């Protein structure tokens, strides 16, 4: 009946590989690297299948038991390497979207007339929304309450200030000769950049 | 749209548990 236990390791290995194969195929980041990592999980997984099957067939053999334990170690090491790369891939995707928002904020800031300001605002709003969802999912995975709070705070500043930068820039365009509006626009822009760097650093902590 | 971490989380856990259970296997009746 020991095979009942070996079957479960096999079932779990296949289940894991199925998920890994899909992430490696669909990833826009670390694609080749994820593929190599999954290939090894598969390689070590098949070695474990053989070792576990031998152990289950001859439980008292200190040798077969030893081969199984070592094959188990190699398998779990490969699983760990895949998890690490999968996690990095998630971080890379978030950092790319953060850059999209950072570039969009600069464009909103510097629109040359109200017509373009409205367009750059419509261009930025959706990217902010997406970034937030992604950063929130990253926040729930952060283990340090410190980094988790920094992340929460940065997301809030970003969402609260995008609408305000639009209003600030609008005032600058409507009143070109008033220096105070430009100073306000720069102040809001600064708050936003600090949120951007906050998200960037918290995401990698 | 779950992250890669979420998609691999439970599967990885099930594999780790199954490996532990196989290693925990001992049955002295097998000796005979």
What does this 3D model show about the protein?
The complex is a heterodimer of chains A (205) and B (32). By secondary structure, chain A is mainly α. Chain A has helices at residues 3-26, 31-57, 62-109, 114-139, 145-174, 179-203. Chain A is 88% helix and 0% strand. In chain A, helix 1 runs antiparallel to helix 2, helix 3 runs antiparallel to helix 4 and helix 4 runs antiparallel to helix 5 (145-174). By secondary structure, chain B is mainly α. The radius of gyration of chain B is 16 Å and the shape is rod-shaped. Chain A binds chain B through residues 2, 5-6, 8-9, 11-13, 15-16, 18-20, 22-23, 27, 52, 55-56, 59-60, 68-69, 72, 75-76, 79, 82-83, 86-87, 89-90, 137-138, 141, and chain B through 3-8, 11-12, 14-19, 21-23, 25-27, 30-31.
Residue fraction in strands of chain B:
under 5%
The description of the largest β-sheet of chain A is: none
Q: Which two chains have the most extensive interface, and how many residues on each?
A: A-B, 36 and 22 residues
The shape of chain B is rod-shaped
Most strands sheet of chain B: none
Report, as a whole number of angstroms, the end-to-end distance of chain A.
46 Å
Number of strands of chain B: 0
According to CATH, what is the class of chain A?
A: Mainly Alpha
Helical/strand content category of chain A: mainly alpha
CATH topology of chain A: Four Helix Bundle (Hemerythrin (Met), subunit A)
Which radius of gyration of chain A do the C-alpha atoms yield? 25 Å
Give the oligomeric state. Answer: heterodimer
The gross shape of chain A turns out to be rod-shaped
- Residue fraction in strands of chain A: under 5%
Helical region count of chain A? Answer: 6
CATH superfamily of chain A: Alpha-catenin/vinculin-like
Structural domain count of chain A: 1
According to DSSP, the number of beta strands of chain A is 0
Work out the helicity level of chain A: over 70%
Radius of gyration of chain B (CA) equals: 16 Å
């Amino acid at each position: 009946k020991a095979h009942v236990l070996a079957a479960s390791v096999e079932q779990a290995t296949e289940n894991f590989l199925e998920k890994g194969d899909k992430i490696a195929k669909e990833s826009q980041f670390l694609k080749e690297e994820l593929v190599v990592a999954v290939e090894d999980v598969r390689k070590q997984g098949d070695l474990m299948k053989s070792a576990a099957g031998e152990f289950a067939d001859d439980p008292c053999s200190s040798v077969k038991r030893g081969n199984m334990v070592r094959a188990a170690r190699a398998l779990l090491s490969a699983v760990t390497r895949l998890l690490i790369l999968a996690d990095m891939a998630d971080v890379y995707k978030l950092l790319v979207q953060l850059k999209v928002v950072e570039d969009g904020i600069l464009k909103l800031r510097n629109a040359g007339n109200e017509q373009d300001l409205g367009i750059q605002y419509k261009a930025l709003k959706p990217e902010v929304d997406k970034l937030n969802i992604m950063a929130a999912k990253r926040q729930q995975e952060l283990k340090d309450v410190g980094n988790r709070d920094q992340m929460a705070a940065a997301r809030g500043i970003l969402q609260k200030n995008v609408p305000i930068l639009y209003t600030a820039s609008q005032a600058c365009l409507q009143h070109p000769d008033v220096a105070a509006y430009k100073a306000n626009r720069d102040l809001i822009y600064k708050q936003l950049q600090q949120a951007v760097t906050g998200i960037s650093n918290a995401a990698q902590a | 749209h779950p992250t890669n971490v979420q998609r691999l989380a439970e599967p990885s856990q099930m594999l780790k548990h199954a490996v532990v259970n196989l290693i925990n296997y001992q049955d002295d009746a097998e000796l005979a």
